[PDB]
Amino acid sequence: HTDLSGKVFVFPRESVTDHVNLITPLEKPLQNFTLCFRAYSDLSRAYSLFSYNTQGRDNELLVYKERVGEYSLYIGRHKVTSKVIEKFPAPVHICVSWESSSGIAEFWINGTPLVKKGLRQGYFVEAQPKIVLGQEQDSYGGKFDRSQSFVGEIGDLYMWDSVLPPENILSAYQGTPLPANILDWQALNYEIRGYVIIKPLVWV
Amino acid sequence: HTDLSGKVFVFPRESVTDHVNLITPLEKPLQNFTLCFRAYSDLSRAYSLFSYNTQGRDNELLVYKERVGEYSLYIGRHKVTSKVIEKFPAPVHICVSWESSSGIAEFWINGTPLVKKGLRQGYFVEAQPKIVLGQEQDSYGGKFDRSQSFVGEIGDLYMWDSVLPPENILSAYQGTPLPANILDWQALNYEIRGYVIIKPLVWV
Amino acid sequence: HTDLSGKVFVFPRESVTDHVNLITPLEKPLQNFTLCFRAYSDLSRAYSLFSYNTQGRDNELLVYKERVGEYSLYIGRHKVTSKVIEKFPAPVHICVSWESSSGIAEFWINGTPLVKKGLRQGYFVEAQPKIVLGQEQDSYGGKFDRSQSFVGEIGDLYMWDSVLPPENILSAYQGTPLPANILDWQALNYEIRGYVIIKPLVWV
Amino acid sequence: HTDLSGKVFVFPRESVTDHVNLITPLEKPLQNFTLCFRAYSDLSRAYSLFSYNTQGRDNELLVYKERVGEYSLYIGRHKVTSKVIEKFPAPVHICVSWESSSGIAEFWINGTPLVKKGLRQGYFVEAQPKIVLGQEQDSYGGKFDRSQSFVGEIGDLYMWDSVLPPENILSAYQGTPLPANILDWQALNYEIRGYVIIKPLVWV
Amino acid sequence: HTDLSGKVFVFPRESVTDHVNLITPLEKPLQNFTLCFRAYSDLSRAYSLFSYNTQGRDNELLVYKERVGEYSLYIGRHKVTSKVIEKFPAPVHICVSWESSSGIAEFWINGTPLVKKGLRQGYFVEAQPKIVLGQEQDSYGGKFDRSQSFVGEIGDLYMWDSVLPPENILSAYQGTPLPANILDWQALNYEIRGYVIIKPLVWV
Numbered sequence A, B, C, D, E: 001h002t003d004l005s006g007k008v009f010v011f012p013r014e015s016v017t018d019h020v021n022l023i024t025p026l027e028k029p030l031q032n033f034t035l036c037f038r039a040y041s042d043l044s045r046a047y048s049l050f051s052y053n054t055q056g057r058d059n060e061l062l063v064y065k066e067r068v069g070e071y072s073l074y075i076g077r078h079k080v081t082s083k084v085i086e087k088f089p090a091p092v093h094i095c096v097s098w099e100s101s102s103g104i105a106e107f108w109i110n111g112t113p114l115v116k117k118g119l120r121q122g123y124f125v126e127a128q129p130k131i132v133l134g135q136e137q138d139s140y141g142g143k144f145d146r147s148q149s150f151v152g153e154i155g156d157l158y159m160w161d162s163v164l165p166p167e168n169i170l171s172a173y174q175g176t177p178l179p180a181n182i183l184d185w186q187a188l189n190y191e192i193r194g195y196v197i198i199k200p201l202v203w204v
């Protein structure tokens, strides 16, 4: 594991090639979780922020951006979308959390909570995933669509297996996150594929 | 009689099913009243905020939202609408009050008074009502329309039988409301029907 | 005479009926004057703010609102209009003054002077008028047009027979007006006709 | 020799008649100069701010306003236009300067310098001019066009025969101008013709 | 070898003639670099900010402005464009840097970093260039297009052969730049050609 503290992955161009493979020992199905990260991009079109597929399952867990001020979350091919007021272009800090028992999906854009939506109550996101950054999988680790490619910068990615409380969300947002157990920026296990440069985080 | 303090009812999806039944011993006709509550929703369409029907009377008392910055009040099937400047989406604090003698309906969005309008002077809203949250009744407790369904969060609901003065409105708005006698959030009598979760109020 | 201090006339609905008759001992023709009052309405259309007719003379003195940020003044059937930047809806404090010698009409929206315009230099507004609030006269005290009706609230009306200087305008605006001699809110002589309620001024 | 300090000329109506003739003490051809004044108008159309014609030459020196946020300067029938961000309606403080050697025209709207433009390098603006305020000359002191008439208020006019430095521009803007030698508000030689009133400057 | 400190080149008009030739002893190919400068223009169309051509190669290094809030960078005929929120018209401070090893182009508008883009990784911009200001070269020092001509003011130009870090960018922006080795405003070697005046920097 590498400590990417103070740095970010910069996907410099539109392609159906460049991407990063995040590696995690997720052996037991996900029931609860929280995902946080920063992104900076001036793309007007829709693009995938975080793709997570398992065998035979497309969009098992996908954080997709529809257009400005509109974020979508997919849980087992199901989808919820919540709106927010935001400038364009501008850096963003996203934290999305889901909880099987209630099915309640909760977005936190820049330390601000959006309206709660619910989906797939009592479902379990399948274990042993293929997590890619920069592209949107339509297969287990592949079948990328160019019009869904993310071009910009991504940093400070953390994923916990629990549903973080407001205090913990804001801390992450403020730069002092709790240690993550599913994916941690300070001990990341990745695989750079294609054209993707690592540079320091200058916009925070 | 449950204390929903620090919590809110979250209606997570559009449906013609989910709703909450508020129960109150209103056995003697309403002549004066004040209703206050918070709501957070990113729905662009129209939707009912508070439905109150009595036997044989539709829209006896309905707080309906026409569109952004436009609120309506129905008293015995009659209606008044007042405008306000507001952002979208964003949490809101609404207090509406009516007084039979003058017929004056008074809205207070986020501690700000909108222009007064008048309707049904000298009328009495029937007692023994059917009060639902999350749907719009077209019958006594039923006949819901999906296109009027409320999806988002609701909290801090209080209803007094008198017409509250400015200082009492602002207190409610500020989080220190006067004890209500028709409906009280700190001693609520409800019936969750369908998909509606209870979660803490994080947006205030 | 009645002291309407801290109160306002609220015209709660669109009609060709409701109005208030202001009674003033004006027996000698007007040569100079200043009018001030507050208004709060969310009407989008045009409406009359202050109508003043004399026998045979329509629009002898009329303060009419064309549309948002556009105020008109009629003096003996002649008209001037001046623009201002304003929000909608929102309470307003208006002061308009006219002086026969120069013909200079001067508007002051919310303590802010608009551009001066000129009309009817050397004219005298007839005395022994018919002053109505809430409707637009097309005859001596009558012939109301529904599409010109004012619906909203009006308060703090004062009318002097002289042309007030800036410091006196701002005082009125700040709530400490000079005693008026043609019409005074603290000693008003009115006649309510139709549906018009008196309530306290909550929006100032 | 009149001191118009603290006052302004108010042109109260659209006409092809009202105007003021400025008479200047200096009889030399112009090579360098600086002009400053305040204006307040809510006219949406184009209109002439300051007209200066000499026998046989139209638009020898003309400060014309094309539309909102767009100011033009004519030197010997030649023209330059520069843009600025501005509200409408709102009072303005304009200072324009030209210098024959370089041909550099320099505008300063509300103490803010616009982009420099250049015209008629090495030209000399004729002497024995006809300077009118409120109309746009198409002949020596005449041939006014109604659609170019200025209606609103003008005050604090000063004109030097040199090109004033930033400090001196800001002083004029702040109300403590350097003594002018071509035209001075505190010792103006004018000739009102038509309907134009003098009133105190209430908007500064 | 001139010190243009506190001054700027002002291109006063649209032409296919006026321009300035920057002279630099670049005999060895560029691999890394940083360019910074201020510009003030109210041109709505596209225009070239900085043209750099070598023998045989067009657009070897060109900083071109597409439209408002949209900046392009060309490296060896290849192009990247990045967006930013900005007012119009308004002065701007631009710093663009490129690094052959990664191919990462980095823009900094008014001390604010835009999203990184990448082009020509492992390329070397040819040495012994023809650098013009005010026009866009389509040949070695010539073939200007009128529709790409820059009209406005440019100042504080500096160009280093290294990729400056955030601190050094902000210093340049704040007026205390590091000494440049490829092009230095305080020791500039230029050649004015056509109508271009030098004046002091009044807008900073």
Ligand SMILES: Nc1ncnc2c1ncn2[C@H]1C[C@H](O)[C@@H](COP(=O)(O)O)O1
Binding pocket: A058, A059, A136, A137, A138, A145, A147, A148
């Ligand atoms: N090529 C293309 N153009 C436009 N919109 C697209 C495209 N591919 C997918 N989508 C949309 C369809 C879904 O709404 C979302 C994820 O679909 P998924 O099927 O997982 O890619 O993206």
Ligand SMILES: Nc1ncnc2c1ncn2[C@H]1C[C@H](O)[C@@H](COP(=O)(O)O)O1
Binding pocket: B058, B059, B136, B137, B138, B145, B147, B148
């Ligand atoms: N299905 C549907 N689509 C759009 N607008 C509707 C619909 N049903 C009612 N309304 C409108 C009609 C009334 O103006 C208001 C309450 O009507 P009420 O009759 O009490 O439902 O909502």
Ligand SMILES: Nc1ncnc2c1ncn2[C@H]1C[C@H](O)[C@@H](COP(=O)(O)O)O1
Binding pocket: C058, C059, C136, C137, C138, C145, C147, C148
């Ligand atoms: N019914 C109606 N609709 C719209 N505008 C109207 C109407 N009646 C008058 N007006 C306009 C005409 C004048 O410009 C102004 C006052 O006219 P006065 O003639 O004094 O009413 O209002």
Ligand SMILES: Nc1ncnc2c1ncn2[C@H]1C[C@H](O)[C@@H](COP(=O)(O)O)O1
Binding pocket: D058, D059, D136, D137, D138, D145, D147, D148
């Ligand atoms: N009547 C009229 N309507 C609109 N625009 C006009 C009119 N007369 C002149 N102009 C324009 C033409 C020039 O651009 C400017 C000054 O021209 P000058 O010829 O000095 O008046 O004003």
Ligand SMILES: Nc1ncnc2c1ncn2[C@H]1C[C@H](O)[C@@H](COP(=O)(O)O)O1
Binding pocket: E058, E059, E136, E137, E138, E145, E147, E148
């Ligand atoms: N005349 C004209 N009008 C509009 N856009 C133009 C023109 N000439 C070039 N361009 C565009 C074409 C390229 O996108 C960019 C640089 O092209 P380059 O070929 O280096 O000039 O400018």
Ligand SMILES: [Ca+2]
Binding pocket: A058, A059, A136, A137, A138, A139
């Ligand atoms: Ca997919």
Ligand SMILES: [Ca+2]
Binding pocket: A136, A137, A138, A143, A144, A145, A148
């Ligand atoms: Ca896809």
Ligand SMILES: [Ca+2]
Binding pocket: B058, B059, B136, B137, B138, B139
């Ligand atoms: Ca109904």
Ligand SMILES: [Ca+2]
Binding pocket: B136, B137, B138, B143, B144, B145, B148
């Ligand atoms: Ca219904």
Ligand SMILES: [Ca+2]
Binding pocket: C058, C059, C136, C137, C138, C139
């Ligand atoms: Ca009339």
Ligand SMILES: [Ca+2]
Binding pocket: C136, C137, C138, C143, C144, C145, C148
């Ligand atoms: Ca009428």
Ligand SMILES: [Ca+2]
Binding pocket: D058, D059, D136, D137, D138, D139
């Ligand atoms: Ca002319």
Ligand SMILES: [Ca+2]
Binding pocket: D136, D137, D138, D143, D144, D145, D148
């Ligand atoms: Ca003309």
Ligand SMILES: [Ca+2]
Binding pocket: E058, E059, E136, E137, E138, E139
């Ligand atoms: Ca070229």
Ligand SMILES: [Ca+2]
Binding pocket: E136, E137, E138, E143, E144, E145, E148
């Ligand atoms: Ca070209």
